[PDB]
Design an enzyme around this catalytic site. Structure first.
Site, PDB file in Angstrom:
ATOM      1  N   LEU A  67      73.363  96.456  78.134  1.00 62.62           N
ATOM      2  CA  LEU A  67      74.557  95.870  78.633  1.00 62.62           C
ATOM      3  C   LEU A  67      74.538  94.498  77.796  1.00 62.62           C
ATOM      4  O   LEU A  67      73.776  94.090  77.525  1.00 62.62           O
ATOM      5  CB  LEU A  67      74.725  95.647  80.094  1.00 62.62           C
ATOM      6  CG  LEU A  67      74.865  96.501  80.949  1.00 62.62           C
ATOM      7  CD1 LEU A  67      74.792  96.383  82.531  1.00 62.62           C
ATOM      8  CD2 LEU A  67      76.312  97.507  80.674  1.00 62.62           C
ATOM      9  N   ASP A  68      75.943  93.664  77.775  1.00 61.64           N
ATOM     10  CA  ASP A  68      75.619  92.691  76.964  1.00 61.64           C
ATOM     11  C   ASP A  68      76.112  91.368  77.714  1.00 61.64           C
ATOM     12  O   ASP A  68      76.021  91.298  78.956  1.00 61.64           O
ATOM     13  CB  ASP A  68      77.000  92.709  76.394  1.00 61.64           C
ATOM     14  CG  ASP A  68      76.757  93.678  74.947  1.00 61.64           C
ATOM     15  OD1 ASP A  68      75.980  94.068  74.637  1.00 61.64           O
ATOM     16  OD2 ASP A  68      78.141  94.015  74.343  1.00 61.64           O
ATOM     17  N   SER A  69      75.887  90.228  77.123  1.00 61.47           N
ATOM     18  CA  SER A  69      75.816  89.057  77.901  1.00 61.47           C
ATOM     19  C   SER A  69      77.053  89.060  78.912  1.00 61.47           C
ATOM     20  O   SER A  69      76.853  88.270  79.953  1.00 61.47           O
ATOM     21  CB  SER A  69      75.905  87.867  76.900  1.00 61.47           C
ATOM     22  OG  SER A  69      76.647  88.134  75.825  1.00 61.47           O
TER      23      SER A  69
END
Ligand code: 3PE
Ligand code: 3PE
Ligand code: 3PE
Ligand code: 3PE
Ligand code: 3PE
Ligand code: 3PE
Ligand code: EHZ
Lengths: 124, 459, 55, 95, 89, 65, 123, 73, 178, 126, 276
Positions: E43-45
């Protein structure tokens, strides 16, 4: 930044930002929880007024001026319109109500001895 | 009235002669009964004042107080058993005796026919009080406070001494009975306009007026609890009792020579009430509450309408009991907290459930809740003040709103909110602390049932 | 934990409210007028801990 | 970000202790070691009130005063015996 | 009664696991407690912000910012939620 | 013992539904019963006169001049 | 709310009546020997039925009836229904009067405006 | 009793208003990731649309049935 | 509330903490759910673009115009949870969270009942005094060379030692006293 | 519309330029100030969490506040203008205002009573 | 008081339209109804004002405890935003809520109807401020609007409450009292109006649009609001009007008069009266 030297007593007491405890981060574990003030941090001169149960200085989504003008505008328009109203009232097409005797002179507590100028009301 | 007094004197022998361990109970138990003998004076089944003897008299105005003066000695001796329980067994017996002499002297002052008997006994009460404040005062500043309490009263006192000796020469006797049934009508000269000020000023000083009230905040701050109770409950009211009996003479001038004080008091009532709103020391706030609620009294003993006077008599007895109650509970917080600061000690109800009920009832007495003599009193002074000038309601109307705010703030920031994290753990309440309170409020509930007894001379 | 005190104040409120209702002389009307005010203060801020209730 | 490897152990350990404190807070069995009526408070209070209202209030002057009873045309007055005259006939029947 | 049954950790544990199994990006057959969001699941920030927000809406309370910039492991969420709600199991 | 439900429609007790339909249905029976017996919600039962149809004789409007 | 107001407030009010002075013209004007109102009830009957002063209208007489049938018939508060219609009618038949009087005063005022101009013959 | 939880799979976006939001979002190219979580809202039991007359008219059917009968007697 | 406040805030945490206020202030405007979930994946787009701006200056110029766009497009009554600061139940139950150092002044009668409770409480108080020394020493031996100092406190780092300054994070009055 | 902080309704943290600053000097303070707080925090947290303590944690920062506010005032008083002009308008201003408010009323009342107009009806009290 | 009662009626009602707290909306409605009560006292119609006080007590009490049921049954959620479809999940309170809502909106033949329309038509027939007459009637349409706001958001909408569901209203202590007041809300206006003594000599003679104005304005008030509630469901951003926030933060009387007065009343004591 010492409070300005105008000899009103402040002395050396720091002039801390005039921001209320309301916007002090509400999640952090403030030593003194309810004053949202830590132990040792310089207390504000007027912390008896910025307390949470008192005044607040917490940013508002609407600018303050915009608020003051709008509120009072509303107040004025209303007050005025109410005046336009008293000038032009609303009254049905009905003549005056008619009470019997002499407008109930005696019963409105009028003097029994002095009879009043008869006020008579006729049919139609 | 020598049973309310001689048995009192004998208390002194008992405080000294009695065992160090049993000294406290002999003195407190006996003066409770001394109060019971005091209740006999209340039996007036006729209007005629009761002139016990040449020097000693008791009329409706003095009787409600003599009983309060006798009542508080028991309580004072019960509120100071804690502090003053760390002393050497001869410092105690001095404090107990000092408290005993105050009511001996105060009982006589309130029960005195000759006005200069009032003066000698009036100004003597300073000796016992100054010792109680200065010798046992906790703070570094009591030497200063004592000076303020002695000079403000003393500089006012010598003018009254000259005035009363002056009227004796003008009329020929300072006997309150005669002075009343004799024609002493001042003549609105420039000089008389000074006499009036001479007689009233000494009384106006110990009844803190807005101009000279700085002595009372400083005095009660460092004074021990017993001294603060005496100053608020009986000492300040000495000034009011004096103004009621002295204005029998100087009858014409106060019609126009009062405006200055009346305005000083009503504006003073607002400002003194307001500074209570942001004062960090609780004892400080109660003291200014005392100045404002006493500023109402000097504004009723000057309007001089029947209702004012008994509004005054109602409020003085009532506020006396309420103030002590507030000063007594302030001390209980001070002894566990060890600081007078209002901001510390938040949330006590969470830890001292009942003291908080006493705090709540004391505050409701402080503000005017209606089935209380406190309200009847203000309602009456308010009425007459309105009669003097309909505008007075504005100023006596800003005070009521402010009085509600500071009275509840004392409850809201001292007895509610989250508990202080970990001040020295607060030991539970002693039964003495709670009784000392109960003894203050149970009489406040009983007097409110039959207000007639404390209504004053006028009605 | 304090249900009984809460019920107690509710009835005290009712007693002051009814006194306010049936009051001939206004001094009694005042007893009711001020009386509901004080118990409202006690009951609005039931949960004293919360500063919002105190405010 | 992500917890610091030395803060995911001060929360690791202190949570472990909080779990024990809350277990200890749990009360053991026995922990608490302790060592129609309707008529009652409706009838008993009532007798008293009545005693008070019929033998003090009633007795004292102007303590229970009541608006006059309503008397309409054609209805009899019990105490005096008079019969209120019937009113003048209503002429209209228009609905 | 009216108040729901108190959360038991092994439940809160399953509840946080479950919601993620409904986030499309996070594989439903790998989400494994101790599977860090930005290092393992990918997942991303910016996702984390949402993953937390879902949890704040599944359990009805707000995970403060500073304490929630770190709800990485899919487990920290399970003890932090429980610690904040006093579940000693 | 109501069982907390997760992402499902809370099961409902017989009584909950019947009491709810009961209170609402009586509301409607009362509105319908009164409407039939007393329909003076509309028109009251007295008609407004047309103030503009009153023969000038009716009001005392003298024959102009 | 209504048009009548618009006449008075908008446009011109010259011919629009002023509610404060409804019988503004001569009472007899327009009527030879107009009959005055008549009251069935008695200054006393009312005083004995304790009718609120306001309720002492020319319908006071049908009211007393209602009140009679409301004290009598006590447990049944739904049965003095004919009596209420009557009272109301009496009053509707009074509101109408108060409306006829207002319309008459309107028209008469107009007469003045018409006549003035008519009577204001050029020469 | 160690409350169980409905199978995560059960939830699906089709058949609910989320699907139409899903399709327009897809037109922009966005994938609408957490839409599946918000499915049980519309999934079942609570699936039926509630119309304003339905609430105001709840129980009207029997209410009128009751009225007719009473009117008869 | 648990972890300590960082001194300055990074660029990221400022951006990523808007994504929360923003999306959460978009669910007051979008009272429904399908509308919301729609109008929000469109929000991410806004943040999704301008994600890889490497030009800090620019990035801090998109952020400063984002938080002004937001301030003027925020809801006056945001949906703030029931138990969070500013909420409706915030600090409601605090009138029942007594601070636990108060069971030490209980009358021997009161503590007579509830017997095993105090048997376990006396154990924990032994734990607290048994480590204050090893704790404070730890707190000190590990005082990093004087310099930046944050409020973060160390873990245990040795068996038997109790992770320090712990007596009030553990032994905290329970949230819902009820 | 740009938010416009007033002495009240102040500029929020966001929307505040200063917040958006990384000048290494600024960050220097922002990290120096935590130290003072962290230091003070680790001087409250191992003295309040200290077993074997009965004495009152003092919070001297509050004692410096009360002294500054009720016992360090008159030692820092210098009578200037803007202080004595404003120190007389406050004590004698309204006190003279109300005198001409009460004298005029009391005089109006007295005149009317003297001339015989004031009704004083059903007033049997005072 | 006719004038200020009138201003409070609309001022409070307009504020209620955007408030998102269920208890807050009911409270504003408490103030708006009393504003109508103040208006009747201002038009010197004391007996009917008292009649509304009694009828007002039954339905407002119901709606609050109705929301008491919803708030307690849900995890203490006091916001209409997260509460939905209570009609199917909890029919007993929803039934009580709509009964109360219609009584608040003066549904014909319910307790509000017997007293409320008497007050409305009283206004339409007396001599009064034109501004007061117009605001009181739209205040009545708004009462229908916010009434509509509560049932649409609280009852007729897809559920938005937290995912675990634990709702129980079976407890006799909930139903019984709610049931008992509901009986009062349905029949009290019938009983009180017939029983009270004839008073006020009402004017039942009106042009039909004034006679039926209360009924129609209430009907379109809901109609317009239902249009509004319906509008939101679309995937198109409306947000709110500039004066909408003015409405949502209570007309800004709280934001401005609560920060200035307590600030300039305390500053003067500490800084000027106390220290100077
Ligand atoms: C106040 C009057 C006290 C009169 C007490 C009479 C009984 C007595 O003898 O007490 C003397 C009193 C106490 O003396 P003692 O009991 O020995 O204990 C203290 C020793 N310094 O010690 C005293 O001398 C008290 C009297 C001092 C002189 C002033 C009296 C007025
Ligand atoms: C400070 C608080 C307020 C104190 C007020 C003190 C006033 C002065 C002292 C008492 C004044 C007084 O007694 O007034 C009356 C006296 C003259 O009175 P009288 O008996 O009429 O003499 C004229 C005879 N044809 O008039 C005087 O005694 C004049 C006194 C002159 C000295 C004034 C005080 C100086 C103090 C140093
Ligand atoms: C609550 C606040 C206190 C209210 C107190 C109300 C009762 C006061 C009272 O009058 O009771 C005592 C009274 C004593 O008798 P007395 O007053 O002399 O009456 C003689 C009349 N010819 O009456 C008696 O002692 C005689 C015996 C009476 C026993 C029953 C008393 C019932 C009183 C009910 C009062 C209710 C109103 C106040 C509370 C509401
Ligand atoms: C805060 C609440 C305030 C509420 C205010 C309510 C005001 C009601 C109306 C009062 C003023 C009009 C009174 C009218 C009475 C009949 C007419 C009359 O003759 O007035 C009596 C008398 C003379 O007044 P006037 O006619 O103006 O003659 C002035 C000649 N130079 O009157 C006089 O004696 C002269 C003075 C009249 C005007 C006095 C104004 C008083 C202002 C009070 C301010 C209150 C706030 C002060 C600050 C508080 C905070 C620090
Ligand atoms: C053709 C001829 C027709 C003759 C009849 C005409 C219709 C008459 C209708 C009258 C209805 C009166 C009524 O039903 O009262 C119920 C009551 C109303 O409200 P109430 O609680 O009395 O509150 C007012 C207090 N002053 O509300 C209550 O008392 C609540 C009682 C709760 C318990 C009720 C349990 C049984 C319910 C049965 C419902 C059927
Ligand atoms: C346009 C004009 C229209 C006509 C005028 C309308 C306004 C007239 C004056 C009304 C009263 C003004 C003060 C009202 C009370 C108040 O504002 O207290 C609220 C204050 C903050 O509370 P708030 O922010 O509302 O709620 C917290 C939300 N998180 O909570 C507080 O505790 C604030 C501090 C209260 C205690 C000190 C307040 C001063 C006390 C003395 C002065 C009282 C006000 C001035 C005198 C009376 C004026 C009528
Ligand atoms: C209803 C509320 C209205 C709110 C509207 C909203 O403000 C609209 C808007 O923010 S308009 C897009 C602004 N978008 C940025 O300001 C991000 C740019 N910042 C970067 O790109 C960084 O350099 C970084 C590399 C750290 C990003 O990485 P990361 O995503 O934080 O992980």
């Amino acid at each position: 930044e010492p409070y300005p030297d105008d000899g009103m007593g402040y002395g050396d007491y720091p002039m801390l930002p005039n921001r209320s405890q309301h916007e002090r981060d509400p999640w952090y574990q403030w030593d003194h929880s309810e004053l949202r003030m830590n132990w040792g941090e310089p207390i504000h001169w007027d912390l008896d007024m910025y307390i949470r149960n008192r005044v607040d200085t917490s940013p508002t989504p609407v600018s303050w001026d915009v608020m003051c003008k709008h509120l009072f505008g509303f107040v004025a328009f209303m007050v005025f319109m109410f005046w336009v109203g008293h000038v032009f009232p609303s009254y049905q097409p009905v003549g005056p109500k008619q009470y019997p005797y002499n407008n109930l002179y005696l019963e409105r507590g009028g003097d029994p001895t002095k009879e009043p100028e008869p006020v008579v009301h006729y049919d139609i | 009235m020598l049973k309310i007094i001689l048995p009192s004197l004998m208390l002194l022998p008992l405080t000294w002669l009695s065992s160090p361990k049993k000294t406290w109970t002999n003195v407190t138990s006996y003066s409770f009964l001394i109060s019971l003998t005091s209740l006999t004076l209340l039996w007036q089944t006729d209007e005629n004042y009761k002139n016990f003897s040449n020097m000693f008299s008791s009329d409706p105005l003095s009787t409600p107080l003599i009983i309060l003066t006798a009542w508080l000695l028991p309580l004072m001796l019960m509120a100071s058993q804690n502090h003053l329980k760390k002393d050497n067994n001869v410092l105690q017996k001095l404090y107990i005796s000092m408290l005993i002499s105050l009511q001996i002297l105060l009982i006589m002052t309130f029960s005195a026919t000759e006005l200069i008997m009032f003066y000698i006994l009036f100004e003597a009460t300073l000796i016992p009080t100054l010792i109680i404040i200065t010798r046992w005062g906790n703070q570094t500043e009591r030497l200063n406070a004592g000076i303020y309490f002695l000079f403000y009263t003393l500089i006012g006192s010598i003018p009254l001494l000259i005035a009363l000796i002056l009227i004796q020469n003008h009329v020929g006797t300072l006997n309150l009975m005669i002075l009343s049934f004799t024609t002493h009508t001042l003549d609105a000269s420039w000089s008389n306009n000074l006499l009036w000020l001479a007689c009233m000023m000494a009384f106006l000083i110990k009844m803190p007026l807005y101009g000279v009230h700085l002595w009372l905040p400083k005095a009660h701050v460092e004074a021990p609890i017993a001294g603060s109770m005496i100053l608020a409950a009986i000492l300040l009211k000495l000034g009011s009792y004096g103004m009621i009996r002295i204005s029998i003479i100087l009858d014409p001038l106060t019609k126009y020579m009062a405006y200055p004080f009346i305005l000083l008091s009503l504006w003073g009532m607002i400002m003194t009430s307001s500074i209570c709103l942001r004062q960090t020391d609780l004892k400080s706030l109660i003291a200014y509450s005392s100045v404002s609620h006493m500023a109402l009294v000097i504004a009723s003993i000057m309007i001089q309408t029947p209702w004012s006077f008994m509004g005054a008599t109602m409020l003085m007895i009532a506020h006396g009991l309420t103030s002590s109650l507030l000063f007594c509970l302030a001390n209980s917080n001070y002894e566990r907290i060890h600081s007078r600061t209002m901001i510390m000690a938040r949330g006590l109800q969470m830890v001292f459930p009942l003291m908080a009920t006493w705090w709540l009832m004391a505050s409701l007495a402080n503000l005017a809740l209606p089935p209380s003599i406190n309200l009847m009193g203000e309602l009456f002074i308010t009425m007459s003040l309105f009669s003097w000038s309909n505008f007075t309601i504005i100023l006596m109307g800003i005070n009521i709103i402010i009085t509600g705010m500071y009275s509840m703030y004392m409850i809201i920031t001292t007895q509610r909110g989250k508990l202080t994290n970990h001040m020295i753990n607060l030991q539970p309440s002693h039964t003495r602390e709670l009784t000392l309170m109960a003894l203050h409020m149970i009489p406040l509930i009983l007097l409110t049932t039959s207000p007639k007894l404390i209504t004053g001379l006028t009605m | 934990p304090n249900i009984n005190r809460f019920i107690k104040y509710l009835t005290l409120f009712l007693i002051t409210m009814l006194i306010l209702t049936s009051a001939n002389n206004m001094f009694q009307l005042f007893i009711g007028w001020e009386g509901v005010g004080i118990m409202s203060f006690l009951l609005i801020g039931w949960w004293y801990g919360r500063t919002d209730a105190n405010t | 970000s992500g917890y610091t490897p030395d803060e995911k152990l001060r929360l690791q350990q202190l949570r472990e202790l909080r779990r024990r404190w809350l277990k200890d807070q749990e009360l053991s069995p026995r922990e608490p070691v302790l060592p129609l009526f309707a008529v009652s408070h409706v009838l008993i209070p009532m007798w008293f009130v009545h005693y008070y209202v019929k033998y003090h209030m009633a007795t004292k002057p102007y303590t229970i005063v009541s608006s006059k009873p309503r008397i309409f045309p054609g209805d009899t007055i019990l105490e005096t015996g008079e019969v209120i005259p019937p009113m003048r006939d209503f002429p209209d029947q228009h609905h | 009664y009216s108040d729901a049954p108190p959360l038991t950790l092994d439940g809160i544990k399953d509840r946080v696991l479950y919601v993620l199994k409904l986030y499309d990006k996070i594989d439903p057959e790998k989400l494994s407690v101790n599977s860090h969001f930005m290092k393992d699941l990918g997942l991303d920030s910016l996702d984390q912000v949402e993953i937390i927000m879902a949890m704040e809406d599944e359990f009805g309370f707000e995970i403060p910012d500073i304490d929630a910039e770190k709800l990485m492991c899919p487990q920290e969420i399970v003890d932090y939620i429980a610690d904040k709600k006093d579940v000693y199991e | 013992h109501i069982q907390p439900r997760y992402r499902e429609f809370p099961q409902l007790t017989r009584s909950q539904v019947i009491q709810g339909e009961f209170l609402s249905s009586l509301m409607w029976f009362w509105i319908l019963w009164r409407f039939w017996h007393d329909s003076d919600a509309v028109l009251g039962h007295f008609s407004y006169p047309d103030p503009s149809q009153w023969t000038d004789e009716e009001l005392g409007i003298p024959p102009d001049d | 709310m209504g048009a009548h107001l618009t006449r008075r407030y908008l446009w011109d009010a010259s011919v629009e009546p002023d509610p404060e002075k409804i019988p503004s013209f001569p009472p007899d004007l327009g009527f030879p020997e107009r009959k005055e109102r008549v009251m069935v009830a008695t200054q006393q009957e009312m005083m004995d039925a304790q009718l609120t002063l306001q309720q002492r209208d020319y319908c006071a007489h049908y009211l007393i009836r209602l009140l009679k049938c409301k004290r009598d018939s006590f447990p049944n508060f739904l049965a003095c229904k004919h009596e209420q219609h009557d009272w109301d009618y009496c009053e509707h038949l009074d509101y109408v009067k108060r409306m006829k009087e207002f319309e008459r005063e309107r028209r008469l005022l107009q007469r003045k405006k018409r006549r003035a101009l008519k009577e204001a013959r050029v020469a | 009793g160690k409350m169980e939880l409905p199978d995560y799979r059960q939830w699906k976006i089709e058949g609910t208003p989320l699907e139409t939001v899903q399709k327009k979002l897809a037109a922009r190219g966005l994938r609408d990731p957490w839409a599946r979580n918000e499915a049980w809202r519309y999934m079942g039991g609570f699936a039926g649309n509630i119309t304003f007359p339905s609430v105001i008219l709840k129980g009207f059917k029997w209410g009128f049935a009751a009225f007719v009968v009473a009117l008869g007697a | 509330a648990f972890c300590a406040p960082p001194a300055y805030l990074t660029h990221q945490q400022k951006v990523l903490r808007l994504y929360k206020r923003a999306l959460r202030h978009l669910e007051s405007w979008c009272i429904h759910r399908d509308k919301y979930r729609y109008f929000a994946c469109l929000m991410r787009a806004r943040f999704e673009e301008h994600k890889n701006e490497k030009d800090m200056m620019r990035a801090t110029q998109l952020l400063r115009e984002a938080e002004e766009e937001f301030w003027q497009n925020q809801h006056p009554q945001p949906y703030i949870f029931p138990d969070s600061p500013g909420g409706t139940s915030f600090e409601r139950y605090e009138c029942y969270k007594v601070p636990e150092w108060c069971l030490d002044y209980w009358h021997p009668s009161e503590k007579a009942m509830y017997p095993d409770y105090f048997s376990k409480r006396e154990q924990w108080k032994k734990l607290r005094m048994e480590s204050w020394d090893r704790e404070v020493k730890q707190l000190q031996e590990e005082t990093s060379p004087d310099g930046i100092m944050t409020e973060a406190l160390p873990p245990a780092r040795r068996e038997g030692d109790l992770p320090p300054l712990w007596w009030h994070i553990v032994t905290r009055p329970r949230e819902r006293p009820t | 519309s740009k938010y416009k902080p007033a002495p009240l309704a102040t500029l929020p943290s966001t929307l505040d330029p200063a917040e958006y600053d990384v000048s290494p000097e600024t960050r220097r303070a922002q990290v120096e100030r935590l130290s003072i707080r962290a230091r003070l925090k680790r001087e409250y947290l191992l003295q309040y969490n200290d077993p074997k303590r009965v004495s009152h944690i003092e919070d001297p920062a509050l004692i410096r506040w009360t002294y500054a506010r009720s016992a360090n005032i008159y030692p820092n008083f210098r009578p200037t203008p803007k202080n004595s002009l404003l120190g007389a308008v406050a004590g004698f201003g309204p006190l003279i205002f109300w005198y001409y408010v009460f004298k005029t009323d009391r005089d109006r009342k007295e005149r009317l009573i003297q001339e015989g107009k004031l009704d004083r009806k059903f007033n049997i009290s005072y | 008081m006719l004038c200020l009662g009138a201003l409070t009626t609309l001022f409070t009602a307009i504020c209620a339209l955007t408030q998102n707290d269920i208890k807050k909306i009911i409270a504003f409605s408490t103030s708006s109804q009393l504003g109508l009560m103040m208006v009747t006292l201002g038009m010197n119609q004391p007996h009917l004002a008292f009649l509304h006080i009694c009828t007002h007590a039954f339905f407002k009490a119901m709606l609050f405890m109705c929301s008491g049921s919803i708030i307690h049954s849900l995890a203490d959620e006091q916001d209409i935003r997260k509460m939905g479809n209570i009609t199917k999940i909890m029919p007993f309170t929803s039934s009580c809520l709509v009964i109360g809502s219609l009584a608040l909106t003066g549904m014909p033949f319910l307790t509000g109807f017997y007293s409320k329309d008497l007050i409305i038509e009283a206004i339409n027939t007396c001599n009064t401020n034109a501004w007061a007459l117009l605001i009181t009637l739209i205040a009545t349409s708004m009462t229908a609007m916010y009434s509509m706001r509560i049932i649409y958001f609280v009852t007729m909408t897809k559920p938005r409450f937290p995912p675990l569901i634990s709702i129980n209203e079976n407890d006799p202590d909930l139903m019984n009292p709610i049931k008992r007041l509901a009986f009062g809300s349905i029949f009290a206006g019938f009983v009180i109006s017939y029983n009270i003594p004839p008073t006020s000599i009402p004017v039942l003679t009106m042009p039909w649009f004034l006679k039926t104005t209360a009924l129609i304005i209430s009907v379109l008030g809901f109609l317009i609001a239902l249009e509004l509630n319906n509008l939101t469901m679309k995937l198109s951003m409306n947000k709110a009007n500039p004066y909408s926030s003015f409405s949502t933060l209570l007309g800004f009387f709280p934001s401005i008069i609560h920060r200035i007065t307590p600030m300039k009343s305390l500053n003067l004591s500490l800084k000027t009266s106390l220290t100077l």
